[PDB]
Design a protein around this ligand. Sequence first.
Ligand code: ATP
Ligand code: ATP
Ligand code: TTP
Ligand code: TTP
Ligand code: GDP
Ligand code: GDP
Ligand code: MG
Ligand code: MG
Lengths: 86, 12, 12, 683, 683
Amino acid sequence: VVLADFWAPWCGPCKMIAPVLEELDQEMGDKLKIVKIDVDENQETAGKYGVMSIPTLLVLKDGEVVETSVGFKPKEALQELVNKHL
Amino acid sequence: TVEPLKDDDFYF
Amino acid sequence: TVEPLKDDDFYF
Amino acid sequence: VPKWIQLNNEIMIQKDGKFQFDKDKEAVHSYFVDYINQNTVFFHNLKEKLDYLVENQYYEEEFLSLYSFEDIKEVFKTAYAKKFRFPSFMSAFKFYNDYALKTNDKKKILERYEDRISIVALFFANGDTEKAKEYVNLMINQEYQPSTPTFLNAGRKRRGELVSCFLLEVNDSLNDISRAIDISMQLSKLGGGVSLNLSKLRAKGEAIKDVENATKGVVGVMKLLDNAFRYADQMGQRQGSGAAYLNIFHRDINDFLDTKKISADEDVRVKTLSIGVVIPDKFVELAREDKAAYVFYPHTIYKEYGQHMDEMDMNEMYDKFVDNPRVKKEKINPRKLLEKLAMLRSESGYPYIMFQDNVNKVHANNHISKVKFSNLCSEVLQASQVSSYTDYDEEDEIGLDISCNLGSLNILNVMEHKSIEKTVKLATDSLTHVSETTDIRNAPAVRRANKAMKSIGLGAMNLHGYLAQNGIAYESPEARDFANTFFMMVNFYSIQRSAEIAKEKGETFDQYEGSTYATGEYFDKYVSTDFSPKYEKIANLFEGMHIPTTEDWKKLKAFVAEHGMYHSYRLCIAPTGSISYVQSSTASVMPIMERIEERTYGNSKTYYPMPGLASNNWFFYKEAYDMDMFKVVDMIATIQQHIDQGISFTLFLKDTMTTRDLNRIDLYAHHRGIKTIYYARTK
Amino acid sequence: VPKWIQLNNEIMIQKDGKFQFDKDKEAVHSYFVDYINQNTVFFHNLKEKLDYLVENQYYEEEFLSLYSFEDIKEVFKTAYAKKFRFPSFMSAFKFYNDYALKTNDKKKILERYEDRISIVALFFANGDTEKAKEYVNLMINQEYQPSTPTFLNAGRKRRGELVSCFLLEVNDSLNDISRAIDISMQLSKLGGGVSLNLSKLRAKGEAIKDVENATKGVVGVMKLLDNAFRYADQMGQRQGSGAAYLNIFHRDINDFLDTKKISADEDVRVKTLSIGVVIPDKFVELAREDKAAYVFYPHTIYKEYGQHMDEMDMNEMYDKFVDNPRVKKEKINPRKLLEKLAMLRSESGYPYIMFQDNVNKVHANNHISKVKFSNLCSEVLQASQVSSYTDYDEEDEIGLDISCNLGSLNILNVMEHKSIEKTVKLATDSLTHVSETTDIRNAPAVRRANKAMKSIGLGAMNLHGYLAQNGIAYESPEARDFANTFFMMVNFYSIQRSAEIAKEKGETFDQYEGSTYATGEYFDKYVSTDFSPKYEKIANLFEGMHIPTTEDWKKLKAFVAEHGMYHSYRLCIAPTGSISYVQSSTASVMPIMERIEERTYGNSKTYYPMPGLASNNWFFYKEAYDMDMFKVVDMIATIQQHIDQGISFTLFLKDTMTTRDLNRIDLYAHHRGIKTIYYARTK
Ligand SMILES: Nc1ncnc2c1ncn2[C@@H]1O[C@H](COP(=O)(O)OP(=O)(O)OP(=O)(O)O)[C@@H](O)[C@H]1O
Ligand SMILES: Nc1ncnc2c1ncn2[C@@H]1O[C@H](COP(=O)(O)OP(=O)(O)OP(=O)(O)O)[C@@H](O)[C@H]1O
Ligand SMILES: Cc1cn([C@H]2C[C@H](O)[C@@H](COP(=O)(O)OP(=O)(O)OP(=O)(O)O)O2)c(=O)[nH]c1=O
Ligand SMILES: Cc1cn([C@H]2C[C@H](O)[C@@H](COP(=O)(O)OP(=O)(O)OP(=O)(O)O)O2)c(=O)[nH]c1=O
Ligand SMILES: Nc1nc2c(ncn2[C@@H]2O[C@H](COP(=O)(O)OP(=O)(O)O)[C@@H](O)[C@H]2O)c(=O)[nH]1
Ligand SMILES: Nc1nc2c(ncn2[C@@H]2O[C@H](COP(=O)(O)OP(=O)(O)O)[C@@H](O)[C@H]2O)c(=O)[nH]1
Ligand SMILES: [Mg+2]
Ligand SMILES: [Mg+2]
């Protein structure tokens, strides 16, 4: 189970989600991998997953996208989103 | 005022 | 938002 | 406060129930002794003064080179032999603050009154010592007063133009409008006021090269002219003043008037552009019968008939325009437009009202052109031909544009000296010299018309002063009889001097043969009616002076027919403003606004009683606002019949008199033959 | 709601979390089928259409007469042989609303896209059928887009001029100011934007012929020009846009800048005059060192040295001006002035920042004149000479006023066709034809410079669209490498075509021998530096195309030395904000403002996705506001080194950034060699 964060350095909401993902890694990092991808440097992956807004959070399970969340989310909402797929 | 003209102001 | 030029902005 | 100003304030300090009018002479004495004699540059001799003034670029050298120094010294002695003394402090204050030459730092005074008059006379004479002395006698007696531009700038290097007015015809093209802006600025930098005829400009919603509803009307051109006059503000010392005239049958007449409304937005309002409205007799007829009128789009008429709207007699062609489907117009209410004019004049004093048919009924040069518009002072009425200014590197068709060569007769000093003939002839010669020496290179039509028409303006001032100082009420029929006789004499001698100049130079004005002077139609009322005074009291005023008779007018008509006439126009009565103080005279032929003028100068309050005011003639100096405007119209129309151009006729209105009263005054002026109405001054 | 607009409204209705970009093709199909075909008048044959359009004053009969009807028919057939289909609804909507010929009542469509293109091609070829078909293939493939005036008005009778912009040099006189107003109104009547250089106008409070402190400065001229452009506003089709450019060392620079302040009063505020500021390297040096700077009075410099302030080298003459007691000046703070510039750009987007030394360090025609100002879009950087307009009946000294004939390459379509050389050469020929057929009788200097300089503007567009559709980030070094290579090839082929035209016609532009093209200084960096792509991904884009090497540039330099150059200026990148929609291209070389533009035309919103925007290239179409402005400056400086004129460089700023960030971007642009900065857009 992987939480992929599509972000950019200029994106205000993406700066707000960064500390939330660090807390989530401390609490769940034994069962959840967190991956960050910068859409300004990695346009091909953002295009492949059809990302048109940031932050976009993809929950992947064994390489397949099982859930998609757009915009800022608090920690508890990200935990609920990931715990469905653990 | 804004008194309008009548027909008798045109003959003297 | 007026922010004064503080030098080191003329050098890059 | 200064001693002279303090003494002047004792005029209103009443002792024994009477104003201390004798304190004013003490005010002049104190003013001179304490300020002028101390702050006038004095030279060891006239030679040193002349060398200092020419060398320091204060005077032109060309006009002084026509005289030997002996002649100039004799002229200056003649000026100072009179020992002229200003009789009121305000006269000396006006001269030594506005017209006296000062040093480049303005700290000192270079010119006395006898010095400015001598220099102006030397300029006028053009190398003639006897003529210069005659001009010196004429001006130091204060019989004749050259206009403010002429008096100020005659013989000075740091100057503008001696011409007071510029009347420009604006054709219906962008090139012509751009040239109008250029010429307006180039003539405003010269100092003279500029008036523009905008009746040829096509209205708002007209077509520019077959694309419809493209024009923004004459209001955009007024915006351009207003900002052009604001830009050419003459240092800001005197703000750039310009006039715009529009025929009342022009479609934009409502928007033309809407720019002077106080409630008008800044997107339409013009500030430095005075406005005048030209009213043909047809509009007055339409208003009289209370029938719907039509304002026409000028370019549709030009396309249909090949002629401009203002070049066609509206009294004849109004019906043709109305029943023409190819002529565009909208129905209006002529009485509503008259009421709008009356309320606009009540609120702001605008527009100037020009009765076109009143002007053209007695216009001598209708063959050259009909008078389509007036000047900024609403007193010049001359034939003008539009100039077709073409694209660059294409030859332009240059028309005729009017200019003011103004000068005023002081009626009081003219009739005290019993020299109506001599004063009128010398003034005509001086105005002819001013017109001839004027060469304006940036205004082609103005220069061409100055060379061709040779038109001058010889006005009169101090009419009310003379009448009140002779125990005649301004509204009294004796005053009108005196004005009739005096201005008939002035017209007689102006025509005589014009014919004499034509004989001596061998040339008349251009297209003179078609004028009523050549055909003799001008002299009809002069050879058929006797203008000698009908009152014994008035006839005694002209005693010692040969009043021209019917036979004398017949001889003058024969002389004009044989020899021609040098000036297309000779007489026009300007408002005669700030220079009226220097001459100690009432302004123009208008009645006095107030018996004692309350003026603010710096931190001081200055009082100027009208000249000759005292206890015996206090009620003869009736205030203009207290007068019956109908009798003032009668007076001006009596004067107007002897003036070939117009008269700057200002309406003096009380606060209680409504717009119907103003409209009644306007319609009575139209009925009595008044050509132009200048201002609506409400108290 | 119309069906096509509703289908276009479905773009943002996201299904499956993805935009429905396929609805735009449906939107354009609905638009055509339901509005365009129904509202297009059809003729039985092309002969009937051409006869109807010529007879009804829609087309000029002159340009169609050089071709036999079979030639025109085959040109139209090869225009329709492409079967061009608009890719987006906004392209067709913009074309058929702004450029397609409509009847006099604007109710039916007379011109298809393939008819506008055919008519423009027939105008360009001027009697050559093969060249007309070449132009048809060029435009129907959308490789080259003629400027909006050229595309809209080529071959039409109800037309203005084909020139998109004019640059006027205003001399320091009333005659020159009035003529500048006249020419501005004349050229705004023609539809082109007018830029005026006010740096030669003497400062406020200067002397007018020994009359000191009489001038109103350049701000009065700005008010005059603003009202002139309001008056000559193309009747309301599009508001008259004018530009005023002033050197930053002019005394009126603060008054010049205060015209765009919101707090400025209406008596000093202009509304239709875009303002631009010319910044020499001396000002940046003074601001960097924090020394107190001096703005100078131009008339004092003219009197002392005999040359206008903007005609001399500021970097050399600044110390001489400061040490000259006869040169009047006032002390300013250059850093405070820079902060004022930044805050003005943040609050209003003005002024246009022009780095004079960045223009003149690589300017090829410095011998003719330095580039003292830019156009209304801050991209036309050409040598100009001021015209000394004298009095009437006096011959004027006509100088050079810049006329810019614009044309845009669609980088996406040029690169996809592998036709840089042919497109650039055909566009150069078309611009040469536009310059030749353009005469302006009311602007002597514009006409003289059009005949002598033969300067053209060949811009480019869809840079960001091409990069994003090729998976290249606009800020990436690969994008800058592609811009370097592509614009080096464009410059190479433009120079080659200019030299070929000079050889064929046997004539070069006036004063070519003194230019760097003749001396070879222009080609030094091209014969020394190789501009082939450094990235294999970028080099693969130019596959099948011969990239000019160092040897090819040496051969071109020798060819130019032997045969000369027909055009003084060839390349200038205009914003092209209107024709970009029709060509389905991003505006200019600027990055896209919005991925999906939201536009309201009527009571319905019409979304325009960026050309080629999709899911796979969503993040390559990065919005300009989110991009680092330093990277955009780097891109434009990479492009600018291959453009002889300027580039309309718009700064896209966020509200979070301060005036110091704007100043930092300005100084980085100056340091990187940016010639002009157009706008400061804030989100
Ligand atoms: N009321 C006045 N109006 C005009 N100028 C005056 C007047 N009073 C004085 N002056 C000027 O001031 C000068 C000296 O004043 P003042 O009256 O003492 O002269 P004055 O020498 O007594 O007179 P006069 O020369 O007539 O014998 C005069 O020569 C004259 O130039
Ligand atoms: N996307 C489009 N771009 C431009 N013109 C279009 C477009 N869609 C329709 N039209 C216009 O409407 C007409 C009818 O459309 P349609 O595509 O059905 O025509 P067609 O000529 O039969 O097509 P095809 O190109 O498939 O042969 C076209 O000939 C063209 O003039
Ligand atoms: C007449 C006039 C000029 N000016 C300014 C604008 C012009 O750039 C400048 C030049 O005026 P000029 O027309 O050149 O003045 P001049 O030729 O009569 O005298 P000089 O050459 O010695 O100056 O004067 C005003 O600002 N307002 C005005 O009303
Ligand atoms: C160019 C222009 C003209 N006009 C008006 C004012 C002029 O009196 C009038 C004539 O302009 P013209 O310069 O005569 O234009 P034109 O010759 O192309 O038009 P046409 O052939 O039909 O006569 O158009 C405007 O109102 N605004 C403008 O921008
Ligand atoms: N001396 C002198 N006379 C002046 C001046 N301005 C005007 N005048 C007049 O010019 C005339 C010539 O005077 P002047 O040269 O002194 O003659 P003089 O008495 O024979 O030496 C006199 O009538 C003066 O009134 C001036 O500044 N100085
Ligand atoms: N018939 C027709 N063709 C037009 C019109 N406007 C542009 N065209 C184009 O001009 C060309 C003229 O060819 P055309 O006369 O129709 O040849 P035809 O098919 O043999 O009759 C065609 O390819 C059309 O696409 C029009 O109004 N009528
Ligand atoms: Mg015309
Ligand atoms: Mg000058």
